[PDB]
Design a protein around this nucleic acid. Structure first.
Ligand SMILES: [Mg+2]
Ligand SMILES: [Zn+2]
Ligand SMILES: [Zn+2]
Ligand SMILES: [Zn+2]
Ligand SMILES: [Zn+2]
Lengths: 652, 1232
RNA sequence: GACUUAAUGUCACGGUACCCAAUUUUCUGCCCCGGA
RNA sequence: UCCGGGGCAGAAAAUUGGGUACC
């Protein structure tokens, strides 16, 4: 009949899309075309469509959602609808035998993913009853159907007995290690045998990119183990985090998945719970976990959908990541110079407890303390909201923020945690990147600044640490003329420096590794893609992505920026902050040290910073902050606002 | 103590359905509309209800105004200091409020002497209700120290009466396409905008602060507000059923759709187009009258019944009557003919922290009001979903896209659309903005959202309610260059030049240079063009608004705030603010003298000014341009089948639509020509689909995912005043292949703009190029500009006939012999004495063998192997040529002396003589089809004989016209095209160059004219005498000087032949030279050769063109001057010879220095077109029709050349009569 | 009154009905034998 | 047994297909 040919066209297009060899670009087109052929005749016939054709409606709907990747942090509404649309038609097949066997097989998997991506609409008990009837309907052909093993294994997550069905699925050929490890854990309460099989899963996880379904499932499995007090997540979270490190090393950008932060939080928490040298080996491992999280920044899919050696290398990453998403469904931490102490910061989203990992090279000692960032973040947002409205007039809100930094982080002033004279390198995390950690008031009467005692350097991550011409001072300038005149025409500046209006290509022109490079321009921040953030220079401006590839000369140069970081990075609407500024783009291309203002200050303050750097580059920035203007924070707070605004990003 | 306040709205406020606080979480629409006016259903049935505003919403707006009022005065109000209040409820001590504050709270350095408590509290703590018996759970009204009752609407009441559901939008900035959408109810502020409620204050200490905050509340429920203390449709459907039933009885069902479109268009014309019978009356003599308005419905003409309907349905008004009747005719037509979304509809609805914002003490905060007018520089379009969908409470289309209007049908610029475009341009000016996140817990602190939170706009509504003009758009099929199936939709667009009252309120401490840049960007002044792209269809140049008459004023809110509250911030009195002078300004409101100039704004110069680069140019059309508007042709008194598109332009000075509509080529046609021009050269047009595609065409012109990087505006005709008669009337007809006369139904006329090479039309149009255009893409647009300048893409319809051919483009400064000799025929040559008489027409019986090529040549690209170019030809008149100008039935002004006598001038445009390209294309088509044994493309199948079978049955099945491309197209139908396939050869109008201008005859009253003999319709009965006879073939007329007989008997013709029986016409003299352009695309090396051979067959062979062909008139010889081809090179004679030879070879294959006479059908064809008297020859064959009988006029004595004797089967049997008719140049007085 | 608010916290002016599509394709203002 | 006559004046097709849910 007409319906027979309809499925004969639609049931082979779906299998063509269902096979792994089909590219995701083609797969999305194939499923939509098959769905258009399928749903198009559903519009013509409505309930006249047979159950077998009603069966295959949901197969397209289940598969069409597979191609609906999350374009942002949240799960898409379109993907949720396709799962909701799929669960409707397949339900219509139940109330309207090989038909019922395969009907409950796909009704259940569509609800399995529906309960996964959106647990509120498809309740756990509702999902439990649905798959419980699959046992009643005997969906236990685990040898031939991959979806079938998913059913008995999503069930034991809920708490169903399934002792009888264990004999089938673990010996089933098409059960993956993560599933086999799950079925070995809660189907029968043998926590021992789940160790070996999941080890194979994590070992195989080093090659499947982070977009794969198994990455989200394996973290969810440890998400189940963690909080169950199973004493097995601690080993498991660390093990899979190791696989993430190997996989991620293959622009310093990573595929975004919601469980990635939980993976690092759970791995960090596992080591923190496990925390002489072996006791301190864990504490160091906290920094490696923390550094690896900040080693690269997650890019939302919509951001990487729209962005040439870097371009060619990126499209391979984008292509490989999208294929794996649909495939599943179908420097040393101690290499720091003596006299320097390094504070690695980690914000845990799992528990509202950030903690700073500190490494004193002179003592060769690893230790950490925990702090509440929940109240500090609100004080930061109060400063951020007030600064964005009033700039220097929000100085009074900066002081209470800097005092809050001291108040909630008192270990910064403790001598044991940070020695009195040791140089402090900061490796902040999330919103602590925006915090002026250097200029923080100790929570005590007439508390001195943290900056006064120690010279503070900032690093986006420890992975940005790196190890020539001593009289060449280049200066770029696209700022208005009236703001920089006496500094503009100083004798020290070299010839290869356009001092009135600079261009994007002229930044790429600097060579020979100058001692000082000055860029004075209006920075502009791309609120979603760090690669698209530009330094407006002449026409168009030069972006973070362009600076990474085009700019090559400034290797080991001490860079000074005239663009406030608040214009280089977007404002913070959440605790997480991985949007890397232009300053760290310079850090990747050598450029040892990038001194720039953390927020908008009057041009005279930047002028004095450059001129004081002109006289002697070896002078520590800390001294200039306390000996000239700042370090007061009580009388004339805007003076303290202007000085503390300058941070030193990048430490060699 | 018991303040009764009235809350009035000055723009459409948002309405939402009321759901209890717990029941609200279930519905996303009501959770989004928590700051809206609540609608509750009174009674049952979901029909009526009562609108109200929660006192908690008025309280939240009031305590927000108290925050601003106290922040402006540094925490005091009228001397009494106020603390910061409280805006944090601990979950442990008690429950949270029903609404949590996501926004920053304005705070200050509290200067109150004591911490506020129950015994003594500041006016802020009194208004908050911090210390009183009223808590989170309501018990009684007496507990409230300050109480806000519900605000009931001042006016059961149906929801549809008060509110209209509208779909709002979230447009992605990077792509220009909507990310998602959401629906609200925009309630009617003009009728249901007043809400009254009681505010009971039991502490007079906060009376002064409360009353001031009521006047400071600026907007509520999505609208600006001021708070002051005090069936016809069913009957139309039935009679539309009557109309459709009548049309079905007349077998004209498909005409109902066009009638419905014409009726909905009739709202533009007004009442006088029906009550004065201003509809076109059809032909002056036609019995059927108008083909649409005279279709008898129930014994009466459709115009009369429309008059009766208007009399019956006068109550609803003309606009509603024509919209409903037009829609009802559409609605019924759809159900007579016939007529779910995958992945659902993209309708999206969206830890608390206290963020105290403390403005610096001594900062000066002001509110700047910008009042101007948004002049629509282009026909604007503000999209709205269909009225069936846009029904509040319930959640077929005559007009595919409707513009947004009011209850009074006034054009509306929504605040949302004006805010979304302002946010778009603010993000452009800043260079950095957010994709607007919905429901975020933290305020977006981006540079755009910061200013957008201080920016308030107004819902602008034009003082102009005339109906919107409809723009029809089609999608060309790239392969066939015809309309894509199912691609025909109409858009309601507002007139250009319409002004809307623009209002922008910025309340802040300093006026940003980015908002100044956007205002300067949107401004029009002197050389600058206003660039306020508002609404949709921007790519087709719909909605380029211009800000004008901008006055920026300043409210000193730190000192002159009692006056600001007294004036209520000029809220709702903004139009009064625009007209009023600086002397009449309200106290405290001063003009903003520091408004940064256009060139002094840094964001404007780098971010907004280079964003869109205009490329203005003047299209010069040396041909009659016809961008057909069929719907408007039916409703206008011209009665023309196709008339040129014209648009309604609003004149702001006259406050009305300009009396003369502006003639233009639509921006959609202007855009589509470019998109095709770029697509065909890059090969992107040939791509099957463009979903998730980033090709050259999709990057430039956008696709379903990305907006176009180029915005096209209309090609306005700037030459209208120059032309004495702007619109030329050109009659066209399809000549039957079998009988040289006209077809039965195929006769029409067009009304193009009278362009000509000497007096061309100038169409000044422009397009906008987005900043960041690739260098390769900039070259693509320039190449497309060159393609249109070169004439590759004619504008409008009838391009292959010669309409809309672009002579050139002016960019604005702001940016060969064929020596074949045919032997002829023996009988004319042997009889040097011209004794024998020949039949004027003869039939070519090629046969039934027709080669239909199923591999149709796509128009989607310039194939490299195929040949595309242009032919320049010279047409010399061997005999007098008659191309009558039927635009004037009395062109010679001699019908006064001879009533009913049809007299025409020679065809001309703007006084310069022409041959229409249709005449050349048609006369070349018949020769090409005869040469290539093609089908009878134009043939009278429905005609009969006097019998068993019609002419279509007698014609061979393979010779029947090609229908559809599935069966393939014959060489003639493959070259010149069919209805399913646009032809690959374009014939231009032939312009007269030189020669003896006219054939002067002294006897004729006009010397240049000639009165012809009676030309009667061909009758197949003679060519097919019996039912056993077949179709003789294609009728061709021999070349002879029989016009001299007509010329020498002019006095006898007029004295005997009835004046209305014959015609008098301006005839050219022999030797006149016309030049026409033949543009061909994707031609085979043989097809170009056959076309070249068809144009210039041989030295002694010419064509027959124009009127009087059977009388020897119109023997025209075409000579090829130059053949140009491009991949623009001048092909030389040797390569032209190469092309023609391949055409001969192809003709050999179908049969199974070329001597064409070896092929039997071409030899028969070529003696038909062979000129016996050409070059130096004494042959003067006597060629004329037999007379009816010996007593008939014109009979010559001594000869038996009569139809009575030749018609008799005894003397001339049927077989030899058809044998004679088939054989060319066979003598007929001494019959062979 | 209620319908119809909850009160120490409503950025919803927190969201452009947006994005794609050439009113076009073919057609000679043409012409002879009869009609009861 | 009779001595003339104008025709067509628009026909066919498309009359909408879809896409879009950052937070
Ligand atoms: Mg209270
Ligand atoms: Zn108080
Ligand atoms: Zn924002
Ligand atoms: Zn494309
Ligand atoms: Zn044909």
């Amino acid at each position: 009949t007409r319906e027979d040919i309809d499925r004969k066209e639609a049931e082979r297009l779906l299998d063509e899309a269902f096979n792994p060899r089909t590219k995701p670009v083609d797969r999305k087109k194939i499923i939509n075309s098959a769905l258009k052929i399928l749903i198009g005749l559903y519009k013509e016939k409505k309930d006249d469509l047979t159950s077998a054709s009603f069966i295959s409606i949901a197969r397209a709907y289940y598969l069409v959602s597979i191609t609906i990747l999350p374009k942002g942090t949240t799960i898409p509404e379109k993907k949720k609808e396709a799962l909701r649309k799929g669960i409707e038609f397949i339900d219509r097949a139940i109330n309207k035998i090989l038909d019922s066997q395969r009907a409950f097989r796909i009704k259940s998997v569509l609800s399995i993913e529906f309960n996964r991506i959106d647990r509120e609409k498809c309740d756990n008990i509702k999902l439990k009853n649905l798959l419980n009837e699959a046992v009643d309907k005997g969906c236990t052909d685990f040898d031939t159907y991959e979806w079938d093993i998913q059913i008995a294994i999503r069930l034991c997550e809920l708490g169903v007995d399934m002792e009888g069905h264990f004999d089938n699925l673990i010996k089933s050929n098409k059960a993956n290690d993560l599933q086999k490890a799950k079925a070995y854990y809660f189907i029968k309460k043998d926590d021992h045998k789940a160790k070996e099989h999941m080890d194979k899963c994590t070992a195989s996880l080093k090659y499947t990119p982070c977009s794969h379904r198994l990455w989200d499932e394996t973290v969810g499995f440890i998400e189940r183990l963690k909080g169950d007090s199973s004493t097995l997540w601690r080993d498991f979270a660390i093990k899979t985090y190791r696989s993430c490190r190997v996989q991620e090393k293959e622009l310093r950008l990573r595929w975004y998945w919601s469980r990635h932060r939980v993976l690092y939080d759970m791995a960090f928490l596992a080591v923190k719970e496990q925390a002489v040298n072996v006791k301190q080996a864990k504490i160091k491992k906290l920094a490696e976990i923390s550094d690896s999280l900040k080693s690269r920044f997650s890019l939302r899919l919509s951001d990487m959908e729209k962005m040439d050696e870097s371009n060619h290398e990126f499209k391979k990453f984008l292509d490989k990541c999208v294929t794996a998403y649909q495939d599943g469904y179908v420097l040393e931490l101690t290499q720091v110079p003596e006299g320097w102490v390094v504070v690695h910061f980690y914000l845990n989203k799992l528990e509202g407890m950030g903690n700073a990992i500190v490494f004193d090279k002179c003592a060769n000692s690893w230790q950490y303390k925990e702090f509440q960032y929940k109240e500090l973040f609100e004080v930061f947002l109060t400063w951020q909201a007030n600064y964005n409205l009033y700039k220097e007039n929000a100085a009074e809100h900066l002081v209470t923020l800097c005092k809050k930094i001291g108040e909630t982080m008192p270990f910064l002033f403790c001598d044991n945690f940070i020695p009195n004279g040791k140089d402090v390198l900061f490796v902040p995390h999330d919103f602590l990147h925006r915090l002026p950690l250097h200029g923080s008031i100790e929570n005590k009467t007439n508390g001195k600044l943290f900056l006064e005692n120690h010279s503070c350097c900032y690093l986006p991550a420890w992975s940005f640490a790196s190890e020539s011409t001593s009289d060449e001072y280049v200066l770029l300038k696209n700022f208005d003329q009236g703001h920089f005149e006496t500094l503009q025409n100083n004798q020290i500046w070299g010839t290869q420096s356009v001092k009135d209006g600079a261009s994007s290509d002229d930044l790429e022109n600097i060579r020979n590794n100058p001692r000082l490079l000055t860029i004075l321009c209006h920075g502009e921040a791309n609120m979603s893609n760090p690669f698209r953030s530009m330094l407006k220079l002449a026409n168009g401006g030069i972006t973070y992505l362009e600076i990474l590839n085009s700019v090559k000369g400034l290797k080991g140069s001490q860079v000074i920026l005239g663009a406030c970081e608040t214009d280089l990075v977007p404002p913070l609407s959440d605790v997480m902050d991985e949007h890397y500024s232009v300053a760290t783009a310079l850090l990747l291309i050598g450029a040892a040290g990038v001194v720039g203002t953390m927020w908008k200050v009057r041009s005279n303050k930047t002028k004095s910073l450059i001129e004081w750097k002109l006289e002697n580059i070896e002078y520590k920035l800390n001294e200039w902050q306390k000996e000239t203007g700042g370090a007061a924070y009580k009388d004339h707070p805007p003076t303290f606002y202007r000085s503390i605004a300058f941070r030193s990003i990048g430490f060699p | 103590m018991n303040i009764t306040v009235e809350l009035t709205f000055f723009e459409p406020y948002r309405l939402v359905e009321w759901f209890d606080w717990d029941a609200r979480k279930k519905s996303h629409s009501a959770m989004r509309g928590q700051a809206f006016a609540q609608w509750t259903w009174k009674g049952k049935g979901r029909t009526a209800g009562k609108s109200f505003i929660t006192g908690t919403l008025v309280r939240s707006a009031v305590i927000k105004a108290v925050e601003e009022l106290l922040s402006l005065n540094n925490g005091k109000w009228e001397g009494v200091p106020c603390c910061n209040g409280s805006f944090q409820t601990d979950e442990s001590k008690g429950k949270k409020p029903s609404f949590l504050r996501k926004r920053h709270t304005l705070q200050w350095q509290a200067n109150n002497k004591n911490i506020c408590d129950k015994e003594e509290a500041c006016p802020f703590c009194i208004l908050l209700g911090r210390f009183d018996n009223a808590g989170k759970v309501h018990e009684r009204n007496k507990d409230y120290d300050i109480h806000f009752s519900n605000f009931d609407l001042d006016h059961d009441l149906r929801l549809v009466d008060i509110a209209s559901g509208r779909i709002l939008n979230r447009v992605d900035f990077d792509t220009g396409k909507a990310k998602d959408y959401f629906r609200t109810w925009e309630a009617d502020y003009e009728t249901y905008g007043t809400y009254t409620g009681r505010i009971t204050l039991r502490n007079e200490h906060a009376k002064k602060l409360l009353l001031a905050s009521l006047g400071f509340v600026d907007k509520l429920c999505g609208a600006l507000c001021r708070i002051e203390v005090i069936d016809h449709n069913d009957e139309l459907r039935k009679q539309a059923e009557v109309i459709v039933e009548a049309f079905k009885q007349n077998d004209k069902l498909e005409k109902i759709r066009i009638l419905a479109d014409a009726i909905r268009t009739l709202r533009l014309h007004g009442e006088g187009v029906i009550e004065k019978d201003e509809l076109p009356d059809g032909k002056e003599e036609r019995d059927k009258g108008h083909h649409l308005w005279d279709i008898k419905v129930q014994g009466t003409a459709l115009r009369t019944k429309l008059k009766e309907l208007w009399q019956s349905n006068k109550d609803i008004g003309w606009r509603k009557f024509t919209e409903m009747l037009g829609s009802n005719l559409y609605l019924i037509y759809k159900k007579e003919t016939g007529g779910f979304r995958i992945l659902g509809d993209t309708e999206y609805y969206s830890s608390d922290l206290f963020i105290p914002v403390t403005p610096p003490e001594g900062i000066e905060t002001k509110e700047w009001i910008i009042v101007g007018r948004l002049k629509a520089a282009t026909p604007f379009y503000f999209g709205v979903q269909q009225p069936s969908d846009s029904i509040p409470g319930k959640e077929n289309e005559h007009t595919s896209f409707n513009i947004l209007l009011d209850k009074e049908n006034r054009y509306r610029i929504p605040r949302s659309a004006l805010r979304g475009a302002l946010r778009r341009d603010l993000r452009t000016a800043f260079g950095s903005g957010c994709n607007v996140s919905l429901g975020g817990q933290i305020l977006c602190n981006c540079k755009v959202c910061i200013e957008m939170r201080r920016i308030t706009l107004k819902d602008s509504v034009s003082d102009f309610s005339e109906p919107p003009e409809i723009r029809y758009r089609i999608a060309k099929n790239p392969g066939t260059a015809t309309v894509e199936d199912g691609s025909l939709f109409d858009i309601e667009v507002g007139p250009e030049g319409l002004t809307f009252p623009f209002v922008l309120r910025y309340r802040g401490h300093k006026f940003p240079e980015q908002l100044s840049s956007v205002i300067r960007y949107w401004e029009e002044n002197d050389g600058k063009n206003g660039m306020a792209w508002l609404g949709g269809l921007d790519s087709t140049g719909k909605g380029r608004f211009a800000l004008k008459d901008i006055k920026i004023f300043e409210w000193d809110l730190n000192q002159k705030i009692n006056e600001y509250i007294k004036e209520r911030g000029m809220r709702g009195k903004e139009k009064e603010l625009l007209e009023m002078g600086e002397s009449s300004l309200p106290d405290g409101l001063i003009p903003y003298k520091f408004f940064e100039e256009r060139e002094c704004l840094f964001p404007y110069k780098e971010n907004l000014k280079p964003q869109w680069s205009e490329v203005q140019y003047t299209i010069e059309v040396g041909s009659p341009l016809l961008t057909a508007d069929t719907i408007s042709a039916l409703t206008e008194p011209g009665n023309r089948d196709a008339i040129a598109y014209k648009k309604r332009v609003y004149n702001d000075g006259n406050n009305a639509i300009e009396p003369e509509p502006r003639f233009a080529v639509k921006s959609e046609t202007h855009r589509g020509i470019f998109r095709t021009a770029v697509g065909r050269r890059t090969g992107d047009l040939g791509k099957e689909d463009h979903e998730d595609c980033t090709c050259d065409m999709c990057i430039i012109f956008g696709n379903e995912h990305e907006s176009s990087k180029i915005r096209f505006e209309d090609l306005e005709l700037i030459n209208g005043n120059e032309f004495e008669k702007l619109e030329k009337h050109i009659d066209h007809v399809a000549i039957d292949r079998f009988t040289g006369g006209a077809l039965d139904k195929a006769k029409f006329d067009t009304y193009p703009l009278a362009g000509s090479p000497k007096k061309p039309l100038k169409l000044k149009g422009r397009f906008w190029i987005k900043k960041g255009f690739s260098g390769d893409h900039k070259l693509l647009i320039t190449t497309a500009l060159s393609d249109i300048r070169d004439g590759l893409y004619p504008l409008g319809s009838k391009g292959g006939v010669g309409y809309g051919w672009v002579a050139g483009i002016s960019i604005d400064d702001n940016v060969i012999n064929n020596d074949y000799v045919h032997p002829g025929h023996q009988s004319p040559k042997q009889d040097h004495k011209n004794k024998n008489i020949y039949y004027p027409h003869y039939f070519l019986d090629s046969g039934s063998k027709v080669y239909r090529e199923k591999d149709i040549i796509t128009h989607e690209e310039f194939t490299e192997e195929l040949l595309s170019g242009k032919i320049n030809c010279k047409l010399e008149t061997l005999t007098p040529l008659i191309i009558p100008d039927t635009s004037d039935e009395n062109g010679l002004k001699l019908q006064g002396n001879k009533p009913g006598h049809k007299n025409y001038k020679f065809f001309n445009i703007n006084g310069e003589l022409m041959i229409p390209g249709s005449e050349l294309r048609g006369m070349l088509r018949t020769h090409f089809e005869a040469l290539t044994k093609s089908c009878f493309a134009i043939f009278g199948e429905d005609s009969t004989l006097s019998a068993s079978k019609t002419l279509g049955g007698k014609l061979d099945k393979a010779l029947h016209p090609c229908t559809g491309l599935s069966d393939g197209l014959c060489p003639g139908c493959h070259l010149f095209g069919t209805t399913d396939y646009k032809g690959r050869v374009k014939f231009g109008f032939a312009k007269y160059e030189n020669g003896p201008e006219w054939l002067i005859t002294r006897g004729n009253n006009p010397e240049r004219s000639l009165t012809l003999g009676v030309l009667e319709s061909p009758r197949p009965a003679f060519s097919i005498p019996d039912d056993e006879s077949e179709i003789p073939g294609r009728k061709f007329y021999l070349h002879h000087n029989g016009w001299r007989i007509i010329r020498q008997k002019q006095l006898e013709i007029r004295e005997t032949v009835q004046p209305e029986r014959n015609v008098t016409t301006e005839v050219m003299d022999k030797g006149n030279v016309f030049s026409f352009d033949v543009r061909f695309e994707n031609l085979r090396e043989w097809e170009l050769g056959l076309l070249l051979q068809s144009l210039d067959p041989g030295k002694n062979i010419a064509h027959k063109l124009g009127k009087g062909k059977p009388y020897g008139f119109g023997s025209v010889k075409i000579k090829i001057d130059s053949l140009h081809t491009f991949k623009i090179k001048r092909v030389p004679q040797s390569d032209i010879r190469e092309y023609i030879n391949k055409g001969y070879q192809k003709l050999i294959e179908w049969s199974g220095l070329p001597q064409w006479h070896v092929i039997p059908h071409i030899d028969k064809l070529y003696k038909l077109l062979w000129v016996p008297f050409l070059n130096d020859s004494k042959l003067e064959p006597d060629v004329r029709y037999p007379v009816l009988n010996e007593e008939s006029k014109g009979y010559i004595e001594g000869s038996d050349y009569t139809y009575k004797k030749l018609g008799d089967k005894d003397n001339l049997p049927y077989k030899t009569r058809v044998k004679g008719l088939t054989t060319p140049w066979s003598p007929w007085n001494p019959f062979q």
